[PDB]
Amino acid sequence: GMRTIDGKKYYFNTNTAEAATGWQTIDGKKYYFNTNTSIASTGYTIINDKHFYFNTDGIMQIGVFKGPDGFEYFAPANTDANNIEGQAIRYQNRFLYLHDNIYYFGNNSKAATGWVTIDGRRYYFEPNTAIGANGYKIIDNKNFYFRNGLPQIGVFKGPNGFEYFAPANTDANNIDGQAIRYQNRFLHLLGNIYYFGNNSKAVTGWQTINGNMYYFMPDTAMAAAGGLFEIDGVIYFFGVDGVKA
Ligand SMILES: CC(=O)N[C@@H]1[C@@H](O)[C@H](O[C@@H]2O[C@H](CO)[C@H](O)[C@H](O[C@H]3O[C@H](CO)[C@H](O)[C@H](O)[C@H]3O)[C@H]2O)[C@@H](CO)O[C@H]1O
Numbered sequence: 001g002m003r004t005i006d007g008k009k010y011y012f013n014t015n016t017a018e019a020a021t022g023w024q025t026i027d028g029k030k031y032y033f034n035t036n037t038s039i040a041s042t043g044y045t046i047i048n049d050k051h052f053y054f055n056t057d058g059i060m061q062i063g064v065f066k067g068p069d070g071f072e073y074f075a076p077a078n079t080d081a082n083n084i085e086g087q088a089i090r091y092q093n094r095f096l097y098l099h100d101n102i103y104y105f106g107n108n109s110k111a112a113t114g115w116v117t118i119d120g121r122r123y124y125f126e127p128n129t130a131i132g133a134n135g136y137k138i139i140d141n142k143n144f145y146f147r148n149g150l151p152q153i154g155v156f157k158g159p160n161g162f163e164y165f166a167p168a169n170t171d172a173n174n175i176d177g178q179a180i181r182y183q184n185r186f187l188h189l190l191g192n193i194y195y196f197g198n199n200s201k202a203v204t205g206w207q208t209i210n211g212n213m214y215y216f217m218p219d220t221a222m223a224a225a226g227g228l229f230e231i232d233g234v235i236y237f238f239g240v241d242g243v244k245a
């Protein structure tokens with residue numbers, strides 16, 4: 001019987017009206033009831049000069065969580081110098097993969113947040129979680145499209161349409177991957193063809209431009225090009241320049 005009164009959770013040894021203290025394994029879960037108050041620990045907690053992290057319900061967590069000195073890695077037993085389960089450990093200058101989530105830990109064993117350069121590459125880790133960014137992101141009024149923390153160069157679909165996340169210095173000295181103003185013009189990138197309207201977004205569907213007909217795929221905004229394509233069940237030929245002929 002584990003009850004919670006006045007926002008404070010306790011673990012009673014059933015038959016006696018007394019609350020328990022210390023580490024307790026309840027339902028496979030680990031809890032630490034402060035030895036001087038019997039109150040269940042929550043959040044960043046120092047125990048015997050070691051760091052542990054508990055959720056709002058007092059359950060000990062394994063992962064990357066923020067403490068007063070930044071995000072620490074509360075790892076499984078024997079991750080470094082036979083550390084105990086849930087304890088924060090020394091983890092310096094290296095990446096951490098917690099199944100598809102990527103973190104990078106600095107020299108201080110704290111996870112990096114914001115923009116950082118690692119081995120010559122620019123990354124962005126979410127300040128709220130320290131997790132490498134993924135997908136469309138607006139950062140300081142600039143748009144990026146990330147994959148595992150890395151800004152990608154290319155044409156990707158965002159909330160407002162396909163934007164051109166361009167190579168560095170294409171406009172206003174943008175850095176690699178920054179979405180830019182690119183209006184009423186074609187974009188030729190690695191063999192693919194796109195056309196951007198006045199809104200700096202790639203057009204899709206059938207389009208007549210300067211008298212030539214093109215069909216830009218709705219899922220990629222790339223022009224049909226270099227052969228026969230069946231569109232809406234009809235077969236057409238598109239030259240390597242994307243023009244139907
Ligand atoms: C103030 C600051 O950030 N200084 C950095 C130190 O915190 C950091 O020391 C490591 O910090 C982690 C927490 O992020 C742990 O405290 C770690 O020690 C703990 O784990 C060890 C096993 O890995 C061992 O069990 C210790 O007994 C236990 O306390 C600690 O080494 C250092 C090193 O990165 O950098 C400082 O800049």
Ligand SMILES: CC(=O)N[C@@H]1[C@@H](O)[C@H](O[C@@H]2O[C@H](CO)[C@H](O)[C@H](O[C@H]3O[C@H](CO)[C@H](O)[C@H](O)[C@H]3O)[C@H]2O)[C@@H](CO)O[C@H]1O
Binds near residue numbers: 160172
């Ligand atoms: C709702 C809508 O579609 N509005 C259109 C604007 O988004 C568009 O503005 C441009 O949009 C691109 C993204 O597609 C960028 O946001 C661009 O600004 C950014 O790049 C600039 C350099 O090229 C500069 O660095 C800015 O600081 C940076 O924010 C922005 O101009 C406009 C113009 O095409 O059309 C609207 O219809």
